């Protein structure tokens, strides 16, 4: 049947799950088809894109700005659900030449984060949206865009997107930091990713005024007593960034970078952890290290 | 003119949604874990002297079915948003995933917050596992506060294994759907 293998494509299923669905009685497919027809999406991509443009418009007095953004978090959550659960075509439209959804999203994230990152008016305005969950939800939106192959590619090729994702590492919510690290790790693992990541962390250093790159990454990682998931994500990312490179001499330079920031001494204590999730990341790193 | 009620169950993978549905309708607890894609069951129920058909819809918890799951949503009368009381992570996903997701697709539809697997809340082996990962089980109080903040109709808990609280979960869902 063929009005099914088209509904199948709209769902962005991994090959193993698509195969499983395919071995379905021709009757069930029909029910699925009926289910799609019954299904209508809430809004088109430009609905959300326009709202985000409204929040960014500096020609607006403070009044309308404060009133416009009073629902910003709600709108972002609806965009995220739309990106994550609508038919994949909804995402293509969002990302397309008419819409330029990825640009506005990256732009809003940058704005939401401008305050945290260190015109006085926009610095005031930013502080308004920087204590809400907006940043975190933008990162979630990027995550949904990235689960779509074509969308992942646009994130890579984008001038600012991974730069801004890296900047979110400064967000004080450890749950947010974890997600950022997971995104950063995924990019780093594909061909061409490592350079984009290093460039992002060079950019981070300059804007944030670090002494050495990865400085604040290490700070947060050392400073965190309580959130195992963030620690798992930190260790994992560190292990990918030093040990996935092609050039062995580059691998050792990267290794020593983290050594000079006290990772080795920190892992000395940390390896005695009780958490088996964290245990495996630390082990993987120790196994990869050179003498 | 037989009256209908559609109830949809959501929450993280391995939270217990299928067991609770099966233990309630069927009175047996299924021992083998088989991850759901989509399923539905139907039951007849009497409230205030009137019979209703209670449609029950099981969903996939895992993210890979994220674009498949919303096909289960239209015409929903009440949602059960489930998390395991011994899985803080599943509790967190309530706020970040499940409530945003049903409110987006089905505005103005009531939901209950459902804590599952309460039998495990006192199991030392379970307490021990959470402990190694700097975690503890969710207390009724904590869950009740979240239910308030997210505007759930109410908070309820159960064990599909012991059937404790199980009936009352569905009692509450029915009432929530007819209010
Ligand atoms: N102790 C205890 N274990 C339970 C209970 N309910 C479910 N489980 C166990 O939890 C595991 C998964 O339950 P299941 O209902 O399959 O989860 P699910 O929520 O449908 N996951 P999915 O989204 O993949 O379908 C199984 O091991 C089941 O045995 C309970 O009330 N008590
Ligand atoms: Mg199941």
Numbering used by the authors:
A (entry chain B): 32 to 149, 205 to 377
B (entry chain A): -1 to 177
Q: How does the study describe this entry?
A:
The mammalian formin-like proteins constitute one family of DRFs, which include the large, multidomain proteins FMNL1, FMNL2 and FMNL3 (also known as FRL1 or formin-related gene in leucocytes, FRL3/FHOD2 and FRL2/FHOD3, respectively). The activity of some formins is regulated by an N- to C-terminal intramolecular interaction that renders the protein inactive, giving rise to the classification as Diaphanous-related formins (DRFs). In DRFs, the N-terminal regulatory domains comprise a GTPase-binding domain (GBD) followed by an FH3 domain that interacts with the C-terminal Diaphanous-autoregulatory domain (DAD). Here we uncover the structural basis of the specificity of FMNL1 and FMNL2 binding towards Cdc42, its membrane association, as well as the dimerization properties of the formin.
To explore the activating complex between Cdc42 and FMNL2, we solved the X-ray crystal structure of the GBD-FH3 domains of human FMNL2 (amino acids (aa) 1–379, termed FMNL2N) with Cdc42 (1–179) bound to the non-hydrolyzing nucleotide analogue GppNHp. The structure was determined to 2.5 Å resolution; the asymmetric unit of the crystal contained one heterodimer and the structure model was refined to an Rwork of 19.4% and Rfree of 25.3% with excellent stereochemistry. The FH3 domain of FMNL2 is composed of 14 canonical helices that assemble into 5 armadillo repeats with the first 2 helices resembling a heat repeat fold. A loop sequence of 55 residues (150–204) that is not resolved in the crystal structure precedes the second helix of this non-canonical element. Strikingly, residues of all five armadillo repeats of the FMNL2 FH3 domain participate in Cdc42 binding and contribute to the specificity of the interaction. On complex formation with FMNL2, the carboxyl groups of E95 mediate salt bridges with H222 and R261 of the formin, thus coordinating two armadillo repeats of the effector protein. Polar interactions and a salt bridge are formed between the amino groups of the two lysines K133 and K131 in Cdc42 with acidic residues E311 and D360 of the fourth and fifth armadillo repeat of FMNL2, respectively. The interaction is sustained by a hydrogen bond between N132 and S361. The sequence motifs 93RKKFRRR on the first and 206RRTLKNSRLVSKK on the second helix assemble in a way that all 12 basic moieties are exposed on the surface of FMNL2 at a position adjacent to the Cdc42 binding site. Particularly, the Rho-GTPase-specific insert helix α4 of Cdc42 is involved in interactions with the fourth and fifth armadillo repeat of FMNL2, contributing thereby to the specificity of the formin recognition.
